[PDB]
């Protein structure tokens, strides 16, 4: 009964040369910031939070899709283009377009995950209006958080190397982190390494829990003795390292240490959900010479 | 020559196009009526199972 | 697909007001969106193949 | 013969999805006569009767799932199922074009390995739908090595109950069902129910009471323990039923597994592989609604629960430790 429908109008008109690119990817899924159906140009990307002015951010992109609502091209007309709305719990179809090109397969779990490849990849440029649509990275759950984790591991020993040159070694660095084995198939990633910068905040975060983590496990422990103790704790004394548990804590003071455990806890839920939880959508069927999937969007 | 014969197996499929004979109103058949279930709607397509 | 230009001869019909004023400079330097200069034998009307 | 194509006049365009409410401004309120079904409170009478409330009855919601079609060989999917298992589609590599690989939990329980007196019913029965367990460890010879490391949690997607299986002798074509309740296929206007094996399903919800508050929801989960038996590894799967929130439940699991976690890293005073310390994962199967019994069969005997009522909302797979 219910209508469903986004049309955003448009200050100027098309170029011929901008039509082409859109009618490239006609199926896609974009983040719009409202849920009405008549709104300008400035949210149908991510250029209202990223752009090249701005530094670009990996955790504040993703702070703002899972509060974002998505939406699927349906037919580019000059000016005006139209979305579809997308439901919660709702069945539709996707094609997928999506530079470099992964291939799905049905009964996987797509993941949107915010893109930090090559902007000619991922960005499509508006001349017309001076505004860039951004298109996201949609990629596989697993590939995503396995796309994530190494080219966060490069994140970090590339801050070695230009820290101090005989730490890291390039060649043992690329093989085996730029290669990614997914599905029986392995796509060698774009480095970029010609100057990374979106992750370089998430390469703060676990870094400074991995300081803070053995000196606080060792106050956790040795404050909950009761005679009352779960069980499984008593266990899990042989997993911590022995060199972890020679901390002499009468070196921080008790308002340091206050201090301290606010900061271990507040970096984790931080850091635990923006893993986690994001627009991710299941697929249950697909086909690999029309390039559709059909979808359904599960909102968490 | 090695020390030992050997026997050899092929197998080989012939296309052909057959006579089928039905005697006269050997099998009764009885025949329902069609119903039909929707199935796999979208936004974009309702599909139909007769 | 948006509108192109084309050099048919529809009709053409018969305009009261002037547009010969500032059209030298205008062309040149692109106030207009889709504009097509004609000299010499090419202001003929042309064929009419299909 | 026309008769029997107007059949389909009738209900096809009797069986459609309802139209966007799209009236013109020109007509006038006639929009507000097209609001049928926002209408919940009916009028009664002295003696009122169905056609008095035919009206009231004819405005239903729309409720629809969307099935899966899997095409599988015949070894591996048994042909003689109850019609309402649960499924899972394992997937390793896209190696031809459509042919595909289905678990239940009887043929994951001969997958693992696990021993006989920890869930001492479906022994027997999954003996004999299958042969020693090799008949299907020939698909995936990376058994001895996905539980290793730990990635055979990540390649199950839950799927749903079975809703049709039209079996050949080579190959069987199964249809699952996700989203919802999925519509029986040879009983007419029925809806299939999920059915669980009594030995798997370990309920959570239990007390004397010795008071818990009533609710809409309780909520099916899939658990997936990585261990090592015989100083081998194999797996175990269990079940779950509470709807206590997500909070309470990954504490109330762990004190099913408590021996399990005690007896494993023992183990590990000697010899620590970070692959090995991965222990758990927990999907979302999807919800039931409250107070439905689940009911209690018998089949060839294997003790079989069935919850009506299922709806399937299947989640990932979250490392429980």
């Given amino acids: 009964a219910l209508d469903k429908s986004i049309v955003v109008n448009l200050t100027s008109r098309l170029f011929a040369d901008e039509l082409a690119a859109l009618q490239s990817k006609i199926g896609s899924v974009l983040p719009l910031g409202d849920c009405h159906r008549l709104q300008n140009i400035q949210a149908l990307g991510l250029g209202c939070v990223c752009s090249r002015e701005t530094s670009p951010d990996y955790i504040q992109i993703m702070q703002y899709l899972s509060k974002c609502t998505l939406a699927v091209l349906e037919e580019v007309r000059p000016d005006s283009l139209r979305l579809t709305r997308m439901d919660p719990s709702d069945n539709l179809q996707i094609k997928n377009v999506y530079a470099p090109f992964f291939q799905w397969d049905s009964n996987t779990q797509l993941a949107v995950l915010p893109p930090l490849f090559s902007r000619k990849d991922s960005t499509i440029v508006l001349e017309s209006n001076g505004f860039d649509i951004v298109f996201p990275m949609v990629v596989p759950q697993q590939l995503g958080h396995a796309i994530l984790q190494q080219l966060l591991v490069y994140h970090i020993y590339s801050k070695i190397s230009a820290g101090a040159p005989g730490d890291v070694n390039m060649a043992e660095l690329d093989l085996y982190t730029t290669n990614v084995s997914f599905m029986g198939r392995t796509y060698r990633l774009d480095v970029d390494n010609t100057d990374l910068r979106v992750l370089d905040d998430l390469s703060m975060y676990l870094c400074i829990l991995s300081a803070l983590v053995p000196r606080g496990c060792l106050r956790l422990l040795t404050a909950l003795v009761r005679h009352d103790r779960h069980p499984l704790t008593e266990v899990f004394e042989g997993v911590v390292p022995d060199e972890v548990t020679r901390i002499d804590l009468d070196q921080l003071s008790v308002p340091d240490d206050i201090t301290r455990m606010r900061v271990m806890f507040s970096y984790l839920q931080s850091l635990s959900s923006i893993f986690n939880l994001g627009p991710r959508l299941h697929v249950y069927a697909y086909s690999a010479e029309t390039l559709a999937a059909s979808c359904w969007y599960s909102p968490r | 020559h090695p020390g030992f014969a050997m026997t050899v197996v092929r197998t080989d499929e012939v296309l052909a196009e057959h006579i089928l004979y039905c005697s006269r109103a050997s099998t009764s058949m009885f025949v329902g009526l069609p119903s039909v279930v929707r199935r796999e709607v979208r936004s974009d397509a309702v599909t139909f199972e007769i | 697909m948006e509108a192109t230009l084309e050099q048919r001869p529809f009709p053409y019909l018969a305009t009261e007001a002037n547009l010969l004023t500032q059209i030298k400079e205008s062309a040149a330097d692109g106030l207009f969106k889709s504009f097509q200069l004609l000299l010499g034998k090419d202001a003929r009307e042309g064929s009419v193949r299909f | ?321």
């Fill in chain 4, 1 to 321: 013969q026309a008769e029997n194509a107007a059949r389909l006049g009738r209900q096809v365009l009797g069986l459609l999805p309802p139209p966007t409410h799209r009236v013109s401004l020109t007509r006038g309120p006639e929009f507000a006569r097209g609001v049928r079904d926002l209408l919940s409170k009916y009028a009664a009478s002295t003696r009122p009767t169905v056609g008095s409330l035919h009206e009231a009855l004819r405005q239903a919601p729309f409720r629809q799932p969307t099935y899966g079609d899997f095409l599988v060989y015949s070894q591996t999917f048994s042909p003689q199922e109850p019609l309402g298992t649960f499924l899972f589609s394992f997937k390793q590599e896209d190696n031809g074009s459509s042919m595909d690989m289905l678990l239940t939990p009887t043929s994951l329980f001969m997958l693992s390995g696990m021993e006989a007196a920890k869930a001492p019913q479906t022994h027997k029965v999954a003996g004999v739908w299958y042969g020693s367990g090799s008949g299907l460890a020939d698909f995936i010879p990376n058994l001895s090595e996905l539980m290793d490391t730990g990635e055979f949690h990540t390649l199950l997607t839950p799927v749903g109950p079975m809703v049709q299986s039209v079996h050949s002798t080579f190959v069987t074509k199964v249809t699952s069902a996700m989203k919802g309740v999925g519509l029986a296929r040879d009983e007419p206007r029925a809806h299939v129910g999920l059915t669980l094996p009594c030995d798997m399903l370990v309920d959570l919800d239990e007390s004397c009471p010795m008071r818990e508050p009533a609710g809409l929801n309780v909520t099916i989960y899939a658990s997936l323990v990585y261990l090592r038996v015989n100083q081998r590894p194999s797996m175990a799967l269990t079940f779950f039923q509470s709807g206590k929130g997500f909070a309470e439940v990954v504490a109330m699991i762990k004190d099913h597994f408590t021996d399990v976690i005690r007896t494993k890293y023992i183990q590990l005073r000697h010899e620590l592989y970070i692959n090995r310390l991965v222990f758990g994962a927990v999907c979302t199967l999807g919800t039931v609604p409250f107070d439905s019994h689940p009911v209690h069969q018998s089949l060839n005997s294997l003790p079989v629960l069935v919850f009506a009522n299922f709806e399937a909302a299947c989640g990932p797979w979250t490392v429980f430790l």
